Write a protein that binds this ligand. Sequence first.
Ligand SMILES: CN[C@@H]1[C@H](O)[C@H](NC)[C@H]2O[C@@]3(O)C(=O)C[C@@H](C)O[C@H]3O[C@@H]2[C@H]1O
Ligand SMILES: [K+]
Ligand SMILES: [K+]
Ligand SMILES: [K+]
Ligand SMILES: [K+]
Ligand SMILES: [K+]
Ligand SMILES: [K+]
Ligand SMILES: [K+]
Ligand SMILES: [Mg+2]
Ligand SMILES: [Mg+2]
Ligand SMILES: [Mg+2]
Ligand SMILES: [Mg+2]
Ligand SMILES: [Mg+2]
Ligand SMILES: [Mg+2]
Ligand SMILES: [Mg+2]
Ligand SMILES: [Mg+2]
Ligand SMILES: [Mg+2]
Ligand SMILES: [Mg+2]
Ligand SMILES: [Mg+2]
Lengths: 80, 200, 131, 87, 163, 134
Amino acid sequence: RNQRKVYQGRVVSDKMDKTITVVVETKKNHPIYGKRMKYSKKYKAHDENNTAKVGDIVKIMETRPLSATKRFRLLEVVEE
Amino acid sequence: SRYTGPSWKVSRRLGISLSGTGKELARRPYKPGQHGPNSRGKVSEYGMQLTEKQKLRHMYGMNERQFRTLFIKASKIKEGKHGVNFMVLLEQRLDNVVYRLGLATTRRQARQLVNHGHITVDGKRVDIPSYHVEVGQVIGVREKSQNISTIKEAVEATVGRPAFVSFDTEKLEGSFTRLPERDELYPEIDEALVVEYYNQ
Amino acid sequence: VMTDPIADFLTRIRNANMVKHETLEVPASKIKRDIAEILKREGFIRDVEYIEDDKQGVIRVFLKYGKNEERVITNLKRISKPGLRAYVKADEVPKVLNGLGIAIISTSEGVITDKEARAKNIGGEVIAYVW
Amino acid sequence: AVKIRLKRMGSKKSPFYRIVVADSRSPRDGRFIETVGTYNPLKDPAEVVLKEDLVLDWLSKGAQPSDTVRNILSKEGVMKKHHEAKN
Amino acid sequence: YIDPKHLELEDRVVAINRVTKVVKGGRRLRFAALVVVGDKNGHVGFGTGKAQEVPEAIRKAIEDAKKNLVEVPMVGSTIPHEVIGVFGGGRILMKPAVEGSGVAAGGPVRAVLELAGVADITSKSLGSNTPINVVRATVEGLKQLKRAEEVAALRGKSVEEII
Amino acid sequence: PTINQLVRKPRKSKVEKSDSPALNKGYNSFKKTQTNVNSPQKRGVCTRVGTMTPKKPNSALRKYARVRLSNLIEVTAYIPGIGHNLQEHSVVLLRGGRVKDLPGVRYHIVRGALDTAGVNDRKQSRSKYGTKRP
RNA sequence: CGCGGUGCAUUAGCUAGUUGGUGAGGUAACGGCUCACCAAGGCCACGAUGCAUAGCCGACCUGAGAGGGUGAUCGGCCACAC
RNA sequence: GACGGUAUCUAACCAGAAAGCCACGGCUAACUACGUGCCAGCAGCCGCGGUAAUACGUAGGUGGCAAGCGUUGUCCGGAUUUAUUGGGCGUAAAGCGAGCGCAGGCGGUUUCUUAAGUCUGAUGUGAAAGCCCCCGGCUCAACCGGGGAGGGUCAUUGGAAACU
Ligand SMILES: CN[C@@H]1[C@H](O)[C@H](NC)[C@H]2O[C@@]3(O)C(=O)C[C@@H](C)O[C@H]3O[C@@H]2[C@H]1O
Ligand SMILES: [K+]
Ligand SMILES: [K+]
Ligand SMILES: [K+]
Ligand SMILES: [K+]
Ligand SMILES: [K+]
Ligand SMILES: [K+]
Ligand SMILES: [K+]
Ligand SMILES: [Mg+2]
Ligand SMILES: [Mg+2]
Ligand SMILES: [Mg+2]
Ligand SMILES: [Mg+2]
Ligand SMILES: [Mg+2]
Ligand SMILES: [Mg+2]
Ligand SMILES: [Mg+2]
Ligand SMILES: [Mg+2]
Ligand SMILES: [Mg+2]
Ligand SMILES: [Mg+2]
Ligand SMILES: [Mg+2]
């Protein structure tokens, strides 16, 4: 069976019930000059029981659309 | 289009004998025009390079566009000197093959023969003077044309066939045994200046 | 504050070489030792020795000047910098002066010259050029 | 439906054809699924290059050869092979 | 040092500059000639000559150039490797060129290379176009060039070991 | 600049402008605006004809025509050649090209096209000045 | 859904089904897609928003290359039919 | 079998019906005569013309190219003239008047580990056509056909651990 994209990230918003906002924190090389630049991507992931809090390192797996902006499902809480 | 004006003026402008006989340069070896005989100023490097390019393309009676495209092909050849290979392609040009075999007194004459279709490559008619003849291909005169005074006069008059060529008079059949060598080619020409000219 | 001790090492060598000093000294670091030994086995620098002190150690380099005090090392150049890193793939390994010079590269196989890197068919980080 | 048909190529008055599998709705010289052979009618014995394995696979899947493609597959025996495989 | 004798040298006049000195009465025009004289086999030099008349300026520059001949390494028809020569506003980059490509360069650099005997090379002028400076910069780059054997000897390794 | 500085503010190049701007813009009667369409020439009507004094180095009476183009822009165009049949309300074709002598002329009036009669007795460079081969 | 490809900051705040939840309805199908209730959330100097311009691409022109410019013909995709 | 008696082939007759365009002061290959007299006019830049003009007009020559030639328009180049490759900031343009400092950028030596960056292998994909390399077909070429290669800061996956 195929696999869905899973990303590590940090929670930055949990004030919404049953959901959390994570950050991916990747880097990219500038097309012209080639230096790596800090690039931040944030996703809205569905939380089952609001287990994750702010500033927690979590894994999220992409899923079918759940809300207007939810496309990810919480898997792990690796740090607090 | 084909050049058809006087040949002596072009040759003496080039400063080298196009026919190789030197007949044009024998008498009044100046550039044409009233200003030819008297003193003329020094030639720039651009003039020299243009003069070499003109030497080659006037030798082979080619237009600039066709000349430039053939020059590009020579560059595409991967091995050897670019200018030497360019001269090699110029030789393999069909008209020059007829001229080297001696079936025509002049390259213009050989070109007219090819254009009128009196030549046949491997027994097949070819009216394209620009046709590219490879090593080993047999160039023969059209059977209906073998008994004409002009080519007969040319064959009898001709006495030196270059080393790379091999010819048979009775069959009127010739072919390049191998690619011509640099020294075998015209030595008065410096292909390097032509290469630099087109590098611009 | 110093931000590239490797560049400082190269520049120490360049300045000492320019004045034709017999020797030079640098604070000891692993990558500095790797560069020094590469130059040693490539014959650019006459000799290398290492001293151990209570800060981090020291590395002393004896320069090489040919007959008539001719400078063997034409110059040194830092390629990969902290501001901008330089990584080269296997086919991208450069040749310094059409091979007359060398390029020191850091790889998963260690710190190697350009010849060795292309022989192993691996890329890496181009630390420096020397010629 | 899926078709095995001739996509026209070459030049004016000098036609050439590629036997390609394409959805019938696609343009003749436009979108196609896969190329399975060639066809040069200009030679007195028409020259054909074919991928018999691919053609048989698509026929089993349900492709419908056009008339000329069917003639080509018959002359190449592919239609007979598919017929036997059905049997 | 290179001895002018024993070498069949040939010269070329790069540029003839009409330089003026203002004197109480008016102008005092002179000609300054820059000349490059070479061997076509790896030796070349350049000289300057200032004189009231063009022939005398040219002669003076030729003598100066002969005195200033230097030797240029040359592998095959080209230089061992790439180089950039800088003098004042002059800045010339010279790279080895494949056989038969020719001498790609401009004016003064062309004269230096042709007289030096290089038949195939690429180059570019990244600095000023002042003839004297570009000629000086060109010779600086050529002097920078190094021989494989010499590099091999200095590094204490064979040419094969270096390459 | 440092690479980081370049990343923060990348290099930006100068923007060129046409030496013949009037040719670059068309006009739309419906929308009553100027379109951005490059044209090798442009038609116009000569609102005036006359002569102008060159800049200080030169002295002559350069012949010029004030022309309103098909895009409604009014410009001044030069009249090359010797003698012309142009008069106000005459339809002309304009090509690019400045006039160093004149201060404010940037376009030339193509000869031999529309009302611009060829140059009488021209016999060299006839293509320019638009006279048929005699 | 990840990632890539315009200009302007003399455009800095934008958002109220908006952001999420619970239900219900609806869809070939997930989903504020719609609705009722609950909360106040959501996006944004990593350029939101606004403004201007523009169909996108395979490709085409140039250049030593990096790049710059273009987006006809042909093919793919999209959008439109006073 | 629309194309269509089309391509194509044969035979006869004739050098007979088939060359213009721009340019020649320097850049830039191409030079002299008159006519003109800061006028007429030329010009891409420099600049030419005031009575002995290779710079204007014409003539004769000559250079370039050719069923084309020249002008205009537009993009790239030359332009290192936005410099990542590939520039600078004492006096030519360019160091904020100075400091404190959030974020950001960068960061001393070393042990182990990790493998995001980085390097590398395999796999999948980046259609076809087109560039490019081979090989054929059209009398040659243009063009056409066949086989490859190329094209990704790609996805999955296996390795390497010097550097970040
Ligand atoms: C009055 N004596 C002067 C004096 O000798 C000047 N030199 C110092 C001298 O200078 C000349 O020789 C010049 O070259 C200038 C010229 C205007 O007068 C000439 O004659 C100038 C003499 O007339
Ligand atoms: K809901
Ligand atoms: K559109
Ligand atoms: K509509
Ligand atoms: K001129
Ligand atoms: K730079
Ligand atoms: K200061
Ligand atoms: K890693
Ligand atoms: Mg033609
Ligand atoms: Mg048939
Ligand atoms: Mg001196
Ligand atoms: Mg639009
Ligand atoms: Mg460039
Ligand atoms: Mg000239
Ligand atoms: Mg004129
Ligand atoms: Mg004139
Ligand atoms: Mg540039
Ligand atoms: Mg000042
Ligand atoms: Mg200043």
